[PDB]
Amino acid sequence: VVGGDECNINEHPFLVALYTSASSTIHCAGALINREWVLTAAHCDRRNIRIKLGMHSKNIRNEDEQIRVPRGKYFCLNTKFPNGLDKDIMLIRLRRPVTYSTHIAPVSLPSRSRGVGSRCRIMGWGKISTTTYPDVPHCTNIFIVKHKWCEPLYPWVPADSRTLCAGILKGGRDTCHGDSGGPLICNGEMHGIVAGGSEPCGQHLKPAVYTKVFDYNNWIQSIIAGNRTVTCPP
Numbered sequence: 001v002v003g004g005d006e007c008n009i010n011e012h013p014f015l016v017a018l019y020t021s022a023s024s025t026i027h028c029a030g031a032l033i034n035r036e037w038v039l040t041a042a043h044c045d046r047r048n049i050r051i052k053l054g055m056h057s058k059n060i061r062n063e064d065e066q067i068r069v070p071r072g073k074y075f076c077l078n079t080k081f082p083n084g085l086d087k088d089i090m091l092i093r094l095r096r097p098v099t100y101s102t103h104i105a106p107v108s109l110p111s112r113s114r115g116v117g118s119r120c121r122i123m124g125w126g127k128i129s130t131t132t133y134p135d136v137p138h139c140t141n142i143f144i145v146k147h148k149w150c151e152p153l154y155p156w157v158p159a160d161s162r163t164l165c166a167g168i169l170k171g172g173r174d175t176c177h178g179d180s181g182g183p184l185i186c187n188g189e190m191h192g193i194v195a196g197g198s199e200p201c202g203q204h205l206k207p208a209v210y211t212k213v214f215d216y217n218n219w220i221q222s223i224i225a226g227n228r229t230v231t232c233p234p
């Protein structure tokens, strides 16, 4: 995250970091939905995903940190594009559940749709400068803007797609490499999943794309409920 500061240590209990059995590098983040499920971006998938929960500083371990691996991964199968990036969302079922604590808690799903003008918050362990990664997660506030700003910039984001275009039109604040899959929080609810923006991040007139979670509530609830035939919203 660029243009922000270290997040409050208690404001991201649902934030998980994603890496692999091969690299300790945090290539994405995700959001804890309940004791056994994490929501993240589909492009964040890797062969041997590893998930760190309850973490803030990468060098100063929180007492309640937990490490988990997937037992199941679910995607949208009805996508406009074959790589599935127009519906960049994925559910990960943890091999073993986690217990809630101060630093490990579920995020609430959106109870209603929020649009242009809404002030939201982004967070992650992604780059904070051109070539620098933070030791702690950084946070900042951005706004949901007209979807037209993202369309000409991102080929995988068609008009009327289930995504929110958000950031700071003037530039300076934005999600960056390593932040994808993380949650976009608006009024205490997760309204988005970081899909991606431009490189370098924070450029003037270049907001980023966030998968609109509200549209996927039914799919998410169904999947967690045990349904394995339900499909994502058209």
Ligand SMILES: *[C@@H]1O[C@H](CO)[C@@H](O)[C@H](O)[C@H]1NC(C)=O
Binding pocket: 222, 227, 228, 229, 230
């Ligand atoms: C999955 O959800 C679909 C759509 O709701 C519906 O047909 C049924 O409720 C579920 N299938 C199963 C096996 O429960």
